[model samples]
Target: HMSTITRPIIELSNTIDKIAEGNLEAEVPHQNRADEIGILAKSIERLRRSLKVAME
Candidate 1:
């Protein structure tokens, strides 16, 4: 289930879940390949758009 986008989505989902449960430091790395990862990365990023305030 770990892909450029789905990977982050999964991680972010987990992080957000943890954060929602009071774990305030779960984070995902934004390491992208920039070539093939572009679309997937952007898609995942878009998915993250409406969730959380995106960390303070």
Candidate 2:
């Protein structure tokens, strides 16, 4: 069960990395279990949303 939770969260670091690299369109690409990693992905998405604003 823990691995299941951790698996997508692991996906998050890479996802955020993509977002950090200007891939706001990037997403967690998972389902359910919106735990810590989910929150992180959302936060990254929010940051990405702001990045466009910062660019302008």
Per lDDT, the best of the predicted structures is 2
Candidate 2 lands at a TM-score of: 0.60
Model 2 RMSD to the real structure?
A: 2.7
Error of 1 at 8 (Å): 1.0
The list of candidate 1 runs beyond 4 A from truth reads: 31-56
lDDT (10s digit) by residue, model 2, range 1-56: 65766677677778878977877667655534367655666676677778767877
**Model 1 CA lDDT for position 38:** 52
* Global Cα lDDT for candidate 2: 0.69
Model 2 residue 20 CA deviation in Å: 2.2
lDDT per residue as tens, model 1, 1-56: 35656766666567556656755444534535565445544554554553445654
lDDT of 2 at 39: 67
